[PDB]
Design a protein around this nucleic acid. Sequence first.
DNA 1: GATTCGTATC
DNA 2: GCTACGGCTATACGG
Lengths: 160, 272, 317, 435, 293
Amino acid sequence: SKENLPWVEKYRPETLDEVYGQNEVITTVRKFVDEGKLPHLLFYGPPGTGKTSTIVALAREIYGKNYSNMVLELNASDDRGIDVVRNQIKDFASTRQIFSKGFKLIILDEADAMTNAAQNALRRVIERYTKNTRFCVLANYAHKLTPALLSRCTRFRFQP
Amino acid sequence: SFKATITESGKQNIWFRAIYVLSTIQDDIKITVTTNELIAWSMNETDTTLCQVRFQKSFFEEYEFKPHGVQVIHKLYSFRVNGRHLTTISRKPDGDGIKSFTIAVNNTSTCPESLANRLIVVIEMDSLIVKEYCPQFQPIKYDPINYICCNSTLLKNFLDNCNVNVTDEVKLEINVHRLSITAFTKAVYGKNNDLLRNALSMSNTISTLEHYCLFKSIIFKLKDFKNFITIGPSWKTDNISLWFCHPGDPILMQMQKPGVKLELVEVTDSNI
Amino acid sequence: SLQLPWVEKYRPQVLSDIVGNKETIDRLQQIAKDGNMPHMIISGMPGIGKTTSVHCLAHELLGRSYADGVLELNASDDRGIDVVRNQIKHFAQKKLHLPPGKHKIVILDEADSMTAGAQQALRRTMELYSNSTRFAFACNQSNKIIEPLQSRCAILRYSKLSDEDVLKRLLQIIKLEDVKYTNDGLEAIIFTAEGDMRQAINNLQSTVAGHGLVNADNVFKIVDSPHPLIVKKMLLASNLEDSIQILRTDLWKKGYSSIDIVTTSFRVTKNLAQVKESVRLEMIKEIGLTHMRILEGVGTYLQLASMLAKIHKLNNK
Amino acid sequence: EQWYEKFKPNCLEQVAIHKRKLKDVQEALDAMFLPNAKHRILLLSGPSGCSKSTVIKELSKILVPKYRQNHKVTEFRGDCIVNDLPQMESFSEFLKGARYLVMSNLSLILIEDLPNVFHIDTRRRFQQLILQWLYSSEPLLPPLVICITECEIPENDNNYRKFGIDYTFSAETIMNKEILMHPRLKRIKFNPINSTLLKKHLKFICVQNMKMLKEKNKWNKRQEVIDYIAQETGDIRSAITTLQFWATSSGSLPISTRESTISYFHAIGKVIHGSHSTNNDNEMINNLFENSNNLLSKEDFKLGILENYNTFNKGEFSISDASSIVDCLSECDNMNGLPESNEYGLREVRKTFRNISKQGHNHGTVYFPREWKVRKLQNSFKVQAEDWLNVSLYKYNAVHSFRNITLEFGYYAPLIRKCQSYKDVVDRIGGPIEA
Amino acid sequence: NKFSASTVHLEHITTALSCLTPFGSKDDVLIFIDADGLSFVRENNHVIKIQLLLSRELFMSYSYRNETEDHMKLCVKINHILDSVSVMNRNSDDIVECTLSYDGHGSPFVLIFEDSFISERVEYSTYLIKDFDTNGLELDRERISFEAIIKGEALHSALKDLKEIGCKECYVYAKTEANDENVFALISKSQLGFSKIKLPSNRSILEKLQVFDGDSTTVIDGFAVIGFFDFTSFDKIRKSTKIASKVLFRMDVHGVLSVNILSQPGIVIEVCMLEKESIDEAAQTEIELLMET
DNA sequence: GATTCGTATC
DNA sequence: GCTACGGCTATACGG
Ligand SMILES: Nc1ncnc2c1ncn2[C@@H]1O[C@H](COP(=O)(O)OP(=O)(O)OP(O)(O)=S)[C@@H](O)[C@H]1O
Ligand SMILES: Nc1ncnc2c1ncn2[C@@H]1O[C@H](COP(=O)(O)OP(=O)(O)OP(O)(O)=S)[C@@H](O)[C@H]1O
Ligand SMILES: Nc1ncnc2c1ncn2[C@@H]1O[C@H](COP(=O)(O)OP(=O)(O)OP(O)(O)=S)[C@@H](O)[C@H]1O
Ligand SMILES: [Mg+2]
Ligand SMILES: [Mg+2]
Ligand SMILES: [Mg+2]
């Protein structure tokens, strides 16, 4: 099954030990997981540097087999307008975590394509439900992100 | 302080319809509590229409009232409550009738913040389900010829056959031979005599009526006349009284029930 | 796994813990002790304490009546013309027995994102019910609130937080958390913060989690220097061979996108000092042509090198 | 209460309004109370806090109890949501009951809380309901006063469908030309309160707070703060609110009032001749783009610059400067509306007009671009050309492209048809060409 | 075919479909095929899940000849099925005999409607199955804090009343008094204020209310469990309580409400719902005061 | 912001 | 007991 896959997808890292090049970011997120306190993360860098591979492996490390019900991954392939932010993200953050792994994780991949109204509405969902949910923002262009959203996120730069 | 309970069916339909009409007239229904009656009234924003419904203490099973907001004239506690909110509490649900509809306000030192400036209404269904509501209220101050005694249903059919969007004004031409009322609307002419608005003049005639005491021509609105007309025919167990004097003077509309008083005052057309 | 981030764990709960803008915080304290709060609009750059000031003022002004006397609405909640006409109207009409001089507070966070119709209905909302409830708008760019709404409010502008208030708050957090630091590390944290408390706390948290000792090396190996300050250095170079060196080493091999460098260069040029207006407008024109070339598909290093070469050509002439 | 609510005027002499403006409002209102008045609606338009309704109420207080055939206004409340009424029908039922407020029930109906006009359908309903009042056949109608506050709608609704109501909340974008140019509608534009009236009223408020002002050792520095507020704002409500906030304070917090938006011609004049507040063009341009980006981004502004750059010295500057300005504008037109395009064009225009600026230059008057006239004449040309084409399709079976029409069919074809008729359209398509 | 099911009581599979629409009107619906029966599972925003089950006894023929796997999973769109079976149902008065079919992974889902004259055949395209697993949103069967058995009509009327009063947020109160009294209420936050609907303690509406100390074994009195729920999720069961004879309410300490609806054989509906954070801890005390009031 | 006409006041 | 039609309500669409 995995042998009939393109090499760019067949060799996708599954653990944080298989992500190379980014040593300072990995050695920081691993300690963040070890202490158990994961802040709101922002991953920035050129295409093909390992941001998605890092965040998916990190979520797998934190949640183990509960990745399915504990991680909400929204990207550019799904609509992420003002109504989506006000309903889906907000009810995912507001509801309980069935006391599984403490806090929830919302991965917003390709958030640079997100409209400014949605990024402005997400600011009071990121800092209100931060006790039970954490947001990770993956972007390649930081000029399309609102300054407040950049302010409420811990920025990690993925070097070439 | 005040506590009233309604434990009949038609007694609840008339209450619900009166509350619905008073909500259609103004967003906030005005309710004053007397030691001998319950006065629910509502006035339009333009101060042209005023419908007032009075429920006597014989209309309720129990009508306790301990005034010992408050305004003496006899003490009178008045308050403002949202019409659209009260019209859903008094709404009769489909499939489960009402056995006891209790309305009360407890503005005493024994009450906590749950009853402070919040009205208490109790609904006990015939399926023993108890539904509790706490609508917020605001204390306020109370603000208190020829004769016609036509039958309400003969008016009712024609009035229901009138749409408010296409007909706005009603003419009431009383004559000793016959009484004919016509729901009409005027035509507005544009720049090059263009028809901005059409003119529909639907009409009906009722032969002379029981007490057509002239001791004429009057014009007033239609959106509240229909509602005040259909208030009373909800407690099935039906004569409306028209007291108007002059074109510029208000018209008074009154109906009677065993324990309900109905009053509607509307400003008439000053055109002579 | 239940430990809160230091941003939320050390969010001030009283007005005395809010550093920076000493006069405005003192005035907010006078409002809290007196009670007669006027309608106010709080504006400023993000992360300087605008929200934590309004919330602390509402808490210190209501106390046990905060649960029923404060209606907090923000961008995450639907704030259309209907919510203003129903929810805000019913909250304003509500009669609550608050102490003398105390009024209900409607905290409309992120008021700059509200629609025009809701803002126009808010005019009537504050006009009818100004004697019972007071509105506290908090925004980032005050012009987004319509002028009829601003006429009924007292505008309070929050300035950028200085390097001393940030150091004071950072030292309080360090003493509370017992982390190891040295002076140059804290100076680097403040420098990378650029007047931001939230970013300074996030950077300190990241440095402590990664290494533990807050020195310049560990801070700068996980936090980066602000790229506007590198773009300014690249654009203000004398001769081309080191401006190209900066653009390559500190902007291209570090991972910054070409469109990001071009967009930052425009804002740097708009605020660049000691440069003639004729030079500045030509630099803006070259940056705009480069921006068009990047947007049309050609996002290469050669297009940025040509822009720097043209800027140096216009500078030397 | 608040100082603008407790120190509100009691009569007309305490209202901060100009004498001439008060006289024109008074006479117009007095004329509209006559039995058959020529004016039916009085549209008051102006900025916020210009005493537009604060003069209407105190004028009604002395006007209504003079013509009431035996005292206050009847104001429309848009937030009222009754049970059985569509939202768009709320104003219709208000105007249908307000028309009964005539003799023995007389009341001046004031519409300051306008209905929701940012939604297109109810805005159109509002317009056609006003037109049904101006063209009403009622022999007697109550006086109608509509106050509209001119405020710029901020940058929102990121769709490119921004209409006029999405840019500026003004009487032009709410009403239509039929209402605005109606024989029975009178418009009295209001101006911001001048410094003298603001100073006088803020000093009356201060002498009414003298005890508290003196106790907080703020009575000798009152003159400077009143002068600064009068010079900074033209809003009476904002001025009184700022004065109250400064007086009730006990520190050195700085005086800050509300922010006003410039006009289109004001921005054009700032770009051309510069501003007197600052001699630094960079700062002025940056503040203009920061506070008024909704106007500096519209193409009509870059068109107004080209239309009015010849008014610097009535058209008596060097041709090289004009060539540089127009070349820069043409180059900016090719930047696809980037933020770097306007910021370069305005900067170049200001730089060009700064160096050639000399003392004693008698400038000219600016005007609005005529591009809309050209665009409507183009549509008229299109209509006439299509009439030519379809009338020349059945009589003489022939197809011709519109590009060939605009070159050889409209000068030659009329010159043939009218010449065949001097012994079926015969006139030049789109009218004759001049100069 | 690996699976074939034939029925004539199409009203059962029609009400089963009508119970699924509340959980979104255009998305993917998962169908689980095993020997016991046919089940439809739908999940919305990872906060609520509904699981109806159509037993093999509801079909004359239920082959399931699949032998390599004990259960078969397929993901199809609900809008295709709803848009299809609507125009099919134009002449539903005819004696129609529905025939479900599935030939394995890669084969479409077949739905034949034969009227002995016309045999309409609809093949639905099957899509890949998403990452989320439906077993995550299930209550822990050893942590039940309250177990209430309620009638269908009373719960449906209460839900319809909550809908008519708006009910932006909802609360569930469950206290068993020591003497004999059982208290179950559905308190709501809405435009009106703070409204409460009290189910009677009589044994015809509330057959059995049993409050545990988070172990489903130790029955204690004087303590109440309170569940803060969003009525957007709580209203998803309203269309299922309309055909419910009895409804079973179960909640654990993890904040999961398991609504069990049994209809009369018949369709078995299981709705699992998550509970909000309740970051504000004054509404809890106000609920207690309101119930004591 | 620019010009032109018209006041009010010191 | 059953059916048709009017009233209530959820949803896609216009501008
Ligand atoms: N550090 C790395 N170690 C190993 N493989 C990597 C690394 N970075 C990228 N890859 C490979 O490149 C593929 C694509 O990288 P992703 O992490 O999925 O995308 P990305 O790097 O975040 O870039 P964008 O912004 O999504 S286009 C992965 O599936 C891996 O196969
Ligand atoms: N003066 C201050 N003193 C202490 N902490 C502060 C201060 N200003 C901001 N913070 C911290 O900043 C974080 C949140 O600040 P906020 O007030 O929410 O930001 P903000 O100023 O409101 O900007 P926006 O526009 O809301 S993103 C918390 O961790 C606070 O502790
Ligand atoms: N001397 C004064 N002259 C005029 N208004 C005064 C004065 N003193 C206090 N005010 C108050 O200032 C406000 C001015 O209101 P107006 O300007 O009439 O309303 P407006 O012009 O419609 O402003 P908007 O557009 O509604 S914000 C009112 O609330 C007055 O009570
Ligand atoms: Mg990626
Ligand atoms: Mg904030
Ligand atoms: Mg006003």
